[PDB]
């Protein structure tokens, strides 16, 4: 047993969409999915939704 985009959003950085019994993460346009199938990596210098400050 494994399931639940609930638990802790299935450790997706962004979109969690449970398929069959697998969490399955996805990213917003402008983010590439990191090989670990959980994290979302910015593709461009100013990705959406990130605060453009002295970060």
């Amino acid at each position: 047993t494994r399931k639940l985009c609930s638990l802790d959003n299935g450790d997706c950085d962004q979109f969690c969409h449970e398929e069959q019994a697998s969490v399955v993460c996805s990213c917003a346009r402008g983010y590439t999915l990191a090989d670990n199938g959980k994290a979302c990596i910015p593709t461009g210098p100013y990705p959406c939704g990130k605060q453009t400050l002295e970060r």
Binding site: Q14, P45, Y46, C48, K50, Q51, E54
Partner: protein, 235 residues
């Protein structure tokens, strides 16, 4: 914004201001891409013609960073019923691309499922805009942002003296005198999830501002994402 906190450097990079002919910012908007700005349908009536300014953090001085762009196409939701304020949403396509920089960045669009749940399940969202700071008071000049908690559908209905439809949602304080106000129409109600900011609604209307007993209401972006991508392709 009545009783907000200030958008510090780079803190609210998606805030667009819609300025009329005499440079009077009559509404706000949310940057979505290099060409498309999201705003709320009725604002299109407050000027014969307008332009969108991004990068603007303070209305008064031209400290650089501010960049105006002309609108090419205005795609409005054809079902906006002015007397209910239902379907209050419109997409503006700008003529010249917005150049991103510190204080200039698109907010992220979510997806209908994971938006409903997760984003509307969060207890709080953020709202901001160059709009009235007190009701019967001046607009803002400094970009104010305010944390507005999500309010459940039934209480929202029970408080508002006008029918709230499933294209609207309430967020605001019952008694705490803090809330979005006149002149924040079209502005972002964004929700933060793990440092990423997702657009969940746009400032529509509300009975006055910070009014004891009522809440500010926003158009539910979750019901329109498909319509948004329609117009972003152009339809």
């Amino acid at each position: 914004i009545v009783g907000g906190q200030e958008c510090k450097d780079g803190e609210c990079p998606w805030q667009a201001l819609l300025i009329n002919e005499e440079n009077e910012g009559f509404c706000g908007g949310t940057i979505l891409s290099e060409f498309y700005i999201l705003t709320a349908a009725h604002c299109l009536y407050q000027a014969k013609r307008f332009k969108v300014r991004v990068g603007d953090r303070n209305t008064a001085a031209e400290e650089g960073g501010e960049a105006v762009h002309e609108v090419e196409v205005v795609i409005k939701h054809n079902r906006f019923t002015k007397e209910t304020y239902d379907f209050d949403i419109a997409v503006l396509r700008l003529k010249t691309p917005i150049t991103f920089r510190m204080n200039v960045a698109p907010a992220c669009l979510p997806e209908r499922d994971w938006a409903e749940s997760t984003l509307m399940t969060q207890k709080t969202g953020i709202v901001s805009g160059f709009g009235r700071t007190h009701e019967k008071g001046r607009q803002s000049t400094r970009l104010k942002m305010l944390e507005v908690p999500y309010v459940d559908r039934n209480s929202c209905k029970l408080s508002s003296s006008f029918i709230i439809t499933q294209n609207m949602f309430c967020a605001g304080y019952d008694t705490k005198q803090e809330d979005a106000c006149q002149g924040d129409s079209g502005g972002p109600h964004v929700t933060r999830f793990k440092d990423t900011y997702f657009v969940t609604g746009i400032v529509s209307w509300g009975e006055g501002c910070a009014r004891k007993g009522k809440y500010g209401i926003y158009t539910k972006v979750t019901a329109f994402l498909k319509w948004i991508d329609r117009s972003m392709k152009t339809r």
